[PDB]
């Protein structure tokens, strides 16, 4: 998924936010990994996407 | 196993409208999300309409109050009515069933020949 | 910040429903209590600063 901008820091046990609690919520006992990377060179439109 | 979608097309009709309608075969389509994606060489990603199952639709912020979509279940064929056709609309429109948040069992069609040039 | 006002809230019921009205309503962190389970606690005094 792609929530928005650079808000990928919100996917963490304890951190709360707008999209971190209304779209994708992570539990406090989450035992896993988290990967994230930008796509400014793959998903980019001359007039916006 | 069968698409039965993207049946239609149009010719060069600047400033007019397009009756582009793409039906769907008799299957277990309940939470389908039909949309329209352009396939102009150079600009592959494109979103136009939305087919949320609750009946409500969302239009792109670019073409606000420009495209109107209505649901039709008489012959199981989705309709789309737009106006104010520009000149750069030369592309290949599709009716994709597995839109974003998908791409696991996604399937496409052959394309609707729609092009305009002043 | 230095001359911050202070209003006393008492003798009323604090329904924590109209508080969630603005869109950029982030950094709503509670210290000592939880964001939920506030519609059942019966406090003594409530202060509001700016």
GROMACS .gro file of N, CA and C in nm, chain B residues 18-115:
model
  294
   67UNK      N    1  -1.886   1.104  -2.600
   67UNK     CA    2  -1.861   0.964  -2.630
   67UNK      C    3  -1.958   0.877  -2.551
   68UNK      N    4  -2.019   0.781  -2.619
   68UNK     CA    5  -2.109   0.684  -2.557
   68UNK      C    6  -2.038   0.556  -2.517
   69UNK      N    7  -1.909   0.564  -2.485
   69UNK     CA    8  -1.829   0.446  -2.452
   69UNK      C    9  -1.890   0.371  -2.335
   70UNK      N   10  -1.934   0.248  -2.361
   70UNK     CA   11  -1.993   0.162  -2.260
   70UNK      C   12  -1.935   0.022  -2.272
   71UNK      N   13  -1.897  -0.036  -2.158
   71UNK     CA   14  -1.834  -0.168  -2.154
   71UNK      C   15  -1.913  -0.255  -2.058
   72UNK      N   16  -1.974  -0.361  -2.110
   72UNK     CA   17  -2.055  -0.451  -2.030
   72UNK      C   18  -1.967  -0.551  -1.955
   73UNK      N   19  -2.031  -0.646  -1.888
   73UNK     CA   20  -1.962  -0.749  -1.812
   73UNK      C   21  -2.037  -0.880  -1.825
   74UNK      N   22  -1.962  -0.989  -1.839
   74UNK     CA   23  -2.023  -1.120  -1.853
   74UNK      C   24  -2.088  -1.164  -1.723
   75UNK      N   25  -2.179  -1.260  -1.734
   75UNK     CA   26  -2.250  -1.312  -1.618
   75UNK      C   27  -2.154  -1.394  -1.532
   76UNK      N   28  -2.113  -1.338  -1.420
   76UNK     CA   29  -2.019  -1.405  -1.330
   76UNK      C   30  -2.052  -1.362  -1.187
   77UNK      N   31  -1.960  -1.389  -1.094
   77UNK     CA   32  -1.979  -1.353  -0.954
   77UNK      C   33  -1.914  -1.218  -0.924
   78UNK      N   34  -1.959  -1.116  -0.996
   78UNK     CA   35  -1.909  -0.980  -0.978
   78UNK      C   36  -1.996  -0.910  -0.875
   79UNK      N   37  -1.943  -0.893  -0.754
   79UNK     CA   38  -2.013  -0.826  -0.646
   79UNK      C   39  -1.942  -0.700  -0.599
   80UNK      N   40  -1.813  -0.710  -0.568
   80UNK     CA   41  -1.733  -0.596  -0.522
   80UNK      C   42  -1.640  -0.545  -0.632
   81UNK      N   43  -1.685  -0.549  -0.757
   81UNK     CA   44  -1.604  -0.503  -0.868
   81UNK      C   45  -1.590  -0.352  -0.867
   82UNK      N   46  -1.475  -0.304  -0.915
   82UNK     CA   47  -1.444  -0.161  -0.921
   82UNK      C   48  -1.396  -0.129  -1.063
   83UNK      N   49  -1.491  -0.099  -1.151
   83UNK     CA   50  -1.458  -0.065  -1.289
   83UNK      C   51  -1.406   0.078  -1.298
   84UNK      N   52  -1.308   0.099  -1.385
   84UNK     CA   53  -1.248   0.230  -1.404
   84UNK      C   54  -1.204   0.242  -1.549
   85UNK      N   55  -1.151   0.360  -1.584
   85UNK     CA   56  -1.105   0.388  -1.719
   85UNK      C   57  -0.962   0.438  -1.712
   86UNK      N   58  -0.872   0.369  -1.782
   86UNK     CA   59  -0.729   0.400  -1.782
   86UNK      C   60  -0.686   0.426  -1.925
   87UNK      N   61  -0.617   0.538  -1.947
   87UNK     CA   62  -0.563   0.569  -2.078
   87UNK      C   63  -0.435   0.491  -2.104
   88UNK      N   64  -0.406   0.470  -2.232
   88UNK     CA   65  -0.287   0.396  -2.274
   88UNK      C   66  -0.214   0.472  -2.384
   89UNK      N   67  -0.201   0.603  -2.367
   89UNK     CA   68  -0.124   0.684  -2.463
   89UNK      C   69   0.024   0.653  -2.445
   90UNK      N   70   0.099   0.629  -2.553
   90UNK     CA   71   0.242   0.599  -2.538
   90UNK      C   72   0.317   0.715  -2.474
   91UNK      N   73   0.370   0.690  -2.354
   91UNK     CA   74   0.440   0.790  -2.275
   91UNK      C   75   0.375   0.817  -2.140
   92UNK      N   76   0.242   0.805  -2.132
   92UNK     CA   77   0.167   0.828  -2.009
   92UNK      C   78   0.076   0.707  -1.987
   93UNK      N   79   0.130   0.604  -1.921
   93UNK     CA   80   0.055   0.481  -1.897
   93UNK      C   81  -0.046   0.494  -1.783
   94UNK      N   82  -0.008   0.541  -1.663
   94UNK     CA   83  -0.105   0.544  -1.553
   94UNK      C   84  -0.206   0.656  -1.571
   95UNK      N   85  -0.334   0.624  -1.548
   95UNK     CA   86  -0.441   0.722  -1.560
   95UNK      C   87  -0.569   0.671  -1.494
   96UNK      N   88  -0.633   0.755  -1.414
   96UNK     CA   89  -0.758   0.721  -1.347
   96UNK      C   90  -0.864   0.823  -1.384
   97UNK      N   91  -0.985   0.775  -1.414
   97UNK     CA   92  -1.094   0.862  -1.457
   97UNK      C   93  -1.213   0.847  -1.364
   98UNK      N   94  -1.270   0.727  -1.358
   98UNK     CA   95  -1.391   0.702  -1.283
   98UNK      C   96  -1.373   0.602  -1.170
   99UNK      N   97  -1.484   0.577  -1.101
   99UNK     CA   98  -1.487   0.485  -0.989
   99UNK      C   99  -1.621   0.414  -0.985
  100UNK      N  100  -1.621   0.290  -0.936
  100UNK     CA  101  -1.739   0.204  -0.934
  100UNK      C  102  -1.753   0.137  -0.798
  101UNK      N  103  -1.748   0.217  -0.692
  101UNK     CA  104  -1.768   0.165  -0.557
  101UNK      C  105  -1.902   0.092  -0.549
  102UNK      N  106  -1.908  -0.023  -0.481
  102UNK     CA  107  -2.034  -0.100  -0.478
  102UNK      C  108  -2.148  -0.029  -0.408
  103UNK      N  109  -2.120   0.066  -0.319
  103UNK     CA  110  -2.226   0.136  -0.247
  103UNK      C  111  -2.305   0.232  -0.335
  104UNK      N  112  -2.264   0.252  -0.460
  104UNK     CA  113  -2.332   0.339  -0.552
  104UNK      C  114  -2.266   0.474  -0.572
  105UNK      N  115  -2.195   0.524  -0.471
  105UNK     CA  116  -2.128   0.652  -0.483
  105UNK      C  117  -2.005   0.641  -0.572
  106UNK      N  118  -1.970   0.752  -0.636
  106UNK     CA  119  -1.856   0.758  -0.726
  106UNK      C  120  -1.766   0.874  -0.688
  107UNK      N  121  -1.642   0.868  -0.736
  107UNK     CA  122  -1.543   0.971  -0.711
  107UNK      C  123  -1.478   1.010  -0.843
  108UNK      N  124  -1.483   1.139  -0.876
  108UNK     CA  125  -1.423   1.192  -0.997
  108UNK      C  126  -1.287   1.252  -0.962
  109UNK      N  127  -1.194   1.247  -1.057
  109UNK     CA  128  -1.061   1.299  -1.033
  109UNK      C  129  -1.066   1.451  -1.013
  110UNK      N  130  -0.977   1.505  -0.929
  110UNK     CA  131  -0.976   1.650  -0.907
  110UNK      C  132  -0.944   1.731  -1.031
  111UNK      N  133  -0.883   1.670  -1.133
  111UNK     CA  134  -0.852   1.743  -1.255
  111UNK      C  135  -0.979   1.775  -1.334
  112UNK      N  136  -1.056   1.672  -1.368
  112UNK     CA  137  -1.179   1.689  -1.444
  112UNK      C  138  -1.300   1.696  -1.351
  113UNK      N  139  -1.299   1.797  -1.264
  113UNK     CA  140  -1.409   1.817  -1.172
  113UNK      C  141  -1.532   1.871  -1.245
  114UNK      N  142  -1.647   1.809  -1.219
  114UNK     CA  143  -1.774   1.847  -1.282
  114UNK      C  144  -1.763   1.845  -1.434
  115UNK      N  145  -1.695   1.743  -1.487
  115UNK     CA  146  -1.673   1.732  -1.630
  115UNK      C  147  -1.719   1.596  -1.682
  116UNK      N  148  -1.709   1.494  -1.597
  116UNK     CA  149  -1.746   1.357  -1.633
  116UNK      C  150  -1.854   1.310  -1.536
  117UNK      N  151  -1.964   1.258  -1.591
  117UNK     CA  152  -2.074   1.206  -1.513
  117UNK      C  153  -2.091   1.058  -1.543
  118UNK      N  154  -2.100   0.976  -1.438
  118UNK     CA  155  -2.112   0.832  -1.450
  118UNK      C  156  -2.241   0.789  -1.381
  119UNK      N  157  -2.317   0.702  -1.448
  119UNK     CA  158  -2.443   0.651  -1.396
  119UNK      C  159  -2.444   0.499  -1.404
  120UNK      N  160  -2.504   0.435  -1.304
  120UNK     CA  161  -2.512   0.290  -1.299
  120UNK      C  162  -2.636   0.243  -1.374
  121UNK      N  163  -2.619   0.138  -1.455
  121UNK     CA  164  -2.728   0.081  -1.533
  121UNK      C  165  -2.723  -0.071  -1.520
  122UNK      N  166  -2.836  -0.131  -1.482
  122UNK     CA  167  -2.845  -0.275  -1.465
  122UNK      C  168  -2.957  -0.336  -1.549
  123UNK      N  169  -3.002  -0.266  -1.654
  123UNK     CA  170  -3.106  -0.320  -1.741
  123UNK      C  171  -3.053  -0.436  -1.824
  124UNK      N  172  -2.945  -0.412  -1.898
  124UNK     CA  173  -2.880  -0.515  -1.980
  124UNK      C  174  -2.741  -0.550  -1.928
  125UNK      N  175  -2.711  -0.515  -1.803
  125UNK     CA  176  -2.581  -0.539  -1.741
  125UNK      C  177  -2.469  -0.474  -1.824
  126UNK      N  178  -2.479  -0.342  -1.837
  126UNK     CA  179  -2.383  -0.265  -1.916
  126UNK      C  180  -2.365  -0.129  -1.852
  127UNK      N  181  -2.241  -0.096  -1.817
  127UNK     CA  182  -2.212   0.031  -1.750
  127UNK      C  183  -2.202   0.143  -1.852
  128UNK      N  184  -2.263   0.257  -1.820
  128UNK     CA  185  -2.264   0.373  -1.907
  128UNK      C  186  -2.169   0.480  -1.855
  129UNK      N  187  -2.127   0.568  -1.946
  129UNK     CA  188  -2.038   0.678  -1.911
  129UNK      C  189  -2.062   0.792  -2.009
  130UNK      N  190  -2.091   0.911  -1.957
  130UNK     CA  191  -2.119   1.028  -2.038
  130UNK      C  192  -2.027   1.141  -1.996
  131UNK      N  193  -1.946   1.190  -2.090
  131UNK     CA  194  -1.855   1.301  -2.065
  131UNK      C  195  -1.877   1.409  -2.170
  132UNK      N  196  -1.829   1.529  -2.140
  132UNK     CA  197  -1.844   1.643  -2.229
  132UNK      C  198  -1.714   1.723  -2.232
  133UNK      N  199  -1.712   1.825  -2.317
  133UNK     CA  200  -1.596   1.913  -2.335
  133UNK      C  201  -1.470   1.833  -2.369
  134UNK      N  202  -1.477   1.764  -2.482
  134UNK     CA  203  -1.365   1.682  -2.527
  134UNK      C  204  -1.250   1.770  -2.574
  135UNK      N  205  -1.131   1.745  -2.520
  135UNK     CA  206  -1.012   1.821  -2.557
  135UNK      C  207  -0.952   1.763  -2.685
  136UNK      N  208  -0.832   1.808  -2.721
  136UNK     CA  209  -0.764   1.761  -2.840
  136UNK      C  210  -0.656   1.658  -2.811
  137UNK      N  211  -0.606   1.652  -2.688
  137UNK     CA  212  -0.501   1.558  -2.649
  137UNK      C  213  -0.557   1.428  -2.593
  138UNK      N  214  -0.685   1.400  -2.614
  138UNK     CA  215  -0.749   1.280  -2.562
  138UNK      C  216  -0.719   1.156  -2.646
  139UNK      N  217  -0.622   1.163  -2.737
  139UNK     CA  218  -0.585   1.048  -2.819
  139UNK      C  219  -0.514   0.945  -2.733
  140UNK      N  220  -0.583   0.837  -2.699
  140UNK     CA  221  -0.527   0.731  -2.616
  140UNK      C  222  -0.608   0.604  -2.639
  141UNK      N  223  -0.583   0.502  -2.558
  141UNK     CA  224  -0.653   0.374  -2.565
  141UNK      C  225  -0.716   0.348  -2.429
  142UNK      N  226  -0.848   0.366  -2.420
  142UNK     CA  227  -0.918   0.350  -2.294
  142UNK      C  228  -0.948   0.202  -2.267
  143UNK      N  229  -0.950   0.167  -2.139
  143UNK     CA  230  -0.978   0.031  -2.095
  143UNK      C  231  -1.080   0.034  -1.982
  144UNK      N  232  -1.144  -0.081  -1.960
  144UNK     CA  233  -1.235  -0.101  -1.847
  144UNK      C  234  -1.176  -0.211  -1.761
  145UNK      N  235  -1.090  -0.173  -1.667
  145UNK     CA  236  -1.020  -0.268  -1.582
  145UNK      C  237  -1.107  -0.301  -1.461
  146UNK      N  238  -1.122  -0.430  -1.433
  146UNK     CA  239  -1.199  -0.475  -1.317
  146UNK      C  240  -1.114  -0.480  -1.191
  147UNK      N  241  -0.990  -0.527  -1.203
  147UNK     CA  242  -0.898  -0.535  -1.089
  147UNK      C  243  -0.808  -0.411  -1.092
  148UNK      N  244  -0.859  -0.303  -1.034
  148UNK     CA  245  -0.786  -0.177  -1.027
  148UNK      C  246  -0.684  -0.183  -0.913
  149UNK      N  247  -0.632  -0.067  -0.872
  149UNK     CA  248  -0.534  -0.058  -0.765
  149UNK      C  249  -0.583  -0.130  -0.639
  150UNK      N  250  -0.489  -0.166  -0.551
  150UNK     CA  251  -0.513  -0.258  -0.439
  150UNK      C  252  -0.544  -0.399  -0.489
  151UNK      N  253  -0.496  -0.430  -0.609
  151UNK     CA  254  -0.514  -0.559  -0.671
  151UNK      C  255  -0.384  -0.611  -0.731
  152UNK      N  256  -0.386  -0.639  -0.861
  152UNK     CA  257  -0.271  -0.682  -0.940
  152UNK      C  258  -0.223  -0.822  -0.905
  153UNK      N  259  -0.302  -0.900  -0.832
  153UNK     CA  260  -0.272  -1.040  -0.807
  153UNK      C  261  -0.334  -1.131  -0.913
  154UNK      N  262  -0.463  -1.116  -0.938
  154UNK     CA  263  -0.529  -1.186  -1.047
  154UNK      C  264  -0.587  -1.088  -1.148
  155UNK      N  265  -0.513  -0.982  -1.176
  155UNK     CA  266  -0.561  -0.875  -1.262
  155UNK      C  267  -0.565  -0.919  -1.407
  156UNK      N  268  -0.671  -0.877  -1.477
  156UNK     CA  269  -0.688  -0.905  -1.619
  156UNK      C  270  -0.734  -0.779  -1.691
  157UNK      N  271  -0.688  -0.763  -1.814
  157UNK     CA  272  -0.720  -0.647  -1.896
  157UNK      C  273  -0.796  -0.692  -2.021
  158UNK      N  274  -0.824  -0.596  -2.109
  158UNK     CA  275  -0.894  -0.625  -2.232
  158UNK      C  276  -0.811  -0.595  -2.355
  159UNK      N  277  -0.876  -0.555  -2.464
  159UNK     CA  278  -0.808  -0.523  -2.589
  159UNK      C  279  -0.803  -0.375  -2.619
  160UNK      N  280  -0.897  -0.296  -2.569
  160UNK     CA  281  -0.892  -0.152  -2.586
  160UNK      C  282  -1.004  -0.095  -2.670
  161UNK      N  283  -1.045   0.028  -2.640
  161UNK     CA  284  -1.148   0.098  -2.715
  161UNK      C  285  -1.082   0.208  -2.798
  162UNK      N  286  -1.096   0.199  -2.930
  162UNK     CA  287  -1.033   0.295  -3.021
  162UNK      C  288  -1.107   0.428  -3.012
  163UNK      N  289  -1.050   0.522  -2.937
  163UNK     CA  290  -1.105   0.656  -2.921
  163UNK      C  291  -0.993   0.756  -2.943
  164UNK      N  292  -1.009   0.844  -3.041
  164UNK     CA  293  -0.907   0.944  -3.072
  164UNK      C  294  -0.974   1.067  -3.131
   0.00000   0.00000   0.00000
